[PDB]
């Protein structure tokens, strides 16, 4: 079933806009009909084939083409969904919230404008992948690391703008951003920070520049199209020691989170702390069929086999030490002593692991910024599928951690899915992350998934736990949880949207923000 | 001599507003006539007495009184100048850009709403001083440090919003901000981040919340009135070692900046690096008259007597080590060895300083977040004066440091002032900071000051060095240096200003931002 037209746009307006788009980028860089397939969400949730359907895609080569495209979108009221590389799998891929939206795919704007070793930064266009930035650095022998999600075909820009995370000390991608160029919804171009100063050499050295700090308003946003972005890069460290701490009991997560709190608040653990459930970690190297025959989620007897077999606990804390050995030894003493008295705890460094293909060896690559695509193998746990996550924010306490594990594993298993969870800590923020793998081809699984997801959001919100990043299908739902003072915050986002984008042509419904023409 | 009415506002409109303000906050907290004196800039620059003249001040007790004052302001078209404590000495104090603006003084809103030890944060109203928050922490025995901008009587909120800086690893005050409550220009109230979720306990734990990141637009801004603000607080570390490294030769600053760069990018130096000129450091414990009776800048023979008398160099680098001894020793080895081979270099710890009142003993207090008013001593160098500062951003290069030292020291000395200066480094950002001490009572000195200041701006901008914070007199002048693409960035600020504040009643001219009614 073909995408419907966006409401308020005629066949003739759409036909005219797509031909005008083709005059700007070339007929070969406007995609309709059979060539739209890759812009669909690969992990379908809806059973309604009229939802989240991109009408076409346009793939520009430059900021100047983006500006022209934006002006044509305003001329015809044809809305655009900007993507850097459009690999936002688990969140909708390249697909828009509103059917009939045209994808603006900036994949071909893939110039690495600068990599600066002595100041540790890069200035990149949206099409630059983590693979590409990593290869450039390696090729040029620069003593810099990148910070990669578990998945390396993504965008250094796109991932950061969606408040993406990785597994080095530079793991908060948007916090490491510094300077951007934006095409505003009127088609005019602006630079933030020191980029506003002609002849500056400081665009990537100082975030604020002068006056209001606005870079943030173009993250998780439909206020602009980002065409260049700076990012800080970690200088190669004097040493690197990745580790795995395993815990034998499901209830250990309570005391583990209590012990993690001071180590994370003080910065003794130098990267994000990630504590993964047994099945989430097993799914890298194993399938359910190799330990259990049921079509249901696993029983506890299986869990015990997997633990001894894979040298994993019910909870698996991956982290890493960075810097000269005397620093790494001192921090390690602090971290190890924090967990040594827990019955059944085990400590591993890479040389301590007895398997060739191993969770610590796999996570050790990500914790030093090596981009890969091996993480997608976890989707084969239950025969093959898509994934979606729920990652709300809570205080770093044992009580909050065990409450979420209990609430979520209960609900997920009620709907026929194995519980795959982790407790993640950035700095002062805990996230219980629910990872759900589903057969996206099965209408009944899709219906169960949607119904489950809505229960997780509601029960989390009732405890004061709010989502920070979500799939196109739930962007309205998450926005409505942020309801303080009768939705005061979204009223302010709406005022800013109407000011910058009076015709509502950028990404209708992104982050639950809709302009005056569609509200 | 009395302040003029703001243009467009009648005596009747003003008198009605003031009558309504008195009923909102009480007659004892609307200040007119003789009681306006404290709201004048204490360090006058302009010789035109009709400039930067507040008409009156209102001191509300609560967010509800702020909302009512803002609605009254919209009713009568009376503009407001929001200050948290108005201690912005060197930037115009509590005085507005535009004469006849009424000061909205929130010093009486001084509740410490929360200090959380296990998560290391505070939630504060704008009237909370560094002195008050430090005294609160000390009395309850909480193992937390604050970060002070050497001006104990200032606002935790107000300083952060103006992008203020201190001397611990938490020195970027606005970077450590997390959650705020803002009264918007229509008098409606909003909470950013996790504060938009009813029942959250995460407002001070996670900056972003969901959707666009907007806290930044209320910093160095007239988009809103901040009434509550969270800030991250450093856990008391396992150890603290403040140090002073002196350089004999003014030309040493070139090689010193070169060696500082990798140490700062990599985080081996854990706080801001501050490299202060002889006179700036000497003026802390001595006056010019102790060494030289002439009215001109000191000569070189006097500089050398001062260096020998005080154990100071032409350049004085104060920094501190934080954390467990084995970490501090490792970082000290790298820092020490970076400078050991410079002829004339000297290394001091507190126990190495002979003088009882001593640069390093005062700086050691600031670099562990002990609030003081010691820093004001440099105003007595030439018998008593005010100060203004020029603090543009540059790359951390010897060539940029020595260029700025030569082009500024020559000009300031040319106009008859002693050069007092420093090279400060945040993380990747160099600042050559010019401190100009002048007789604020003397119209001739004021005129030489204004002339010198304008030359320093133009010569800096010609090199691509832009200011990040300035005095109310120069806010339009600095805005105009950020002129990339025919002033694109300020056209965007103006679009947001007109959307949030259609009647232009918040702080007209803050950061060179004027609404449509005044532009
Ligand atoms: C197995 C697996 C593992 C994953 N691991 C991680 C992980 O560790 N960490 C993580 O963060 N994510 C992870 N993800 C989620 C996701 O796949 C990645 O974050 C991915 O990199 C995002 O796609 P992208 O980088 O191509 O960004 P894009 O798809 O290009 O951008 C994402 C969104 O940002 C906005 N946007 C992008 N570019 C612009 C622009 N120029 N202007 C304006 N708005 C723009 C749009 O709303 C767009 O839809 C994982 C997913 C899976 C399935
Ligand atoms: C000798 C000397 C040393 C100094 N040392 C330092 C230093 O080391 N570091 C440093 O950073 N500064 C320094 N200063 C500058 C200044 O004195 C301090 O930064 C001081 O703390 C700022 O005043 P305040 O905290 O009362 O802020 P305020 O005066 O209350 O606020 C400053 C500005 O921010 C805005 N603002 C404040 N509150 C709000 C609000 N609630 N809503 C909206 N806008 C608001 C307004 O535009 C206001 O004018 C120094 C000054 C002198 C003379
Ligand atoms: Cl460029
Ligand atoms: Cl819209
Ligand atoms: Cl409160
Ligand atoms: Cl510590
Ligand atoms: Cl205005």
Residue numbers in the entry:
A (entry chain A), B (entry chain B): 1 to 519
Paper text:
Pro151 was substituted with isoleucine and valine to mimic the N5 environment of EUGHs. We found that P151V and P151I can operate with oxygen although they are 10- to 40-fold less efficient compared to using 2,6-dichlorophenolindophenol as co-substrate. The crystal structures of the six P151 mutants were also solved. The analysis revealed a consistent pattern: in the oxidase mutants, the 150-153 loop conformations create tunnels that lead to the flavin re side. The ability of nsVAO to use oxygen as electron acceptor thereby aligns with the oxidase activity observed for the P151V mutant of VAD.
A fundamental distinction is that the oxidases efficiently react with oxygen producing hydrogen peroxide whereas the dehydrogenases hardly react with oxygen and typically employ other proteins, such as cytochrome c, as acceptors.
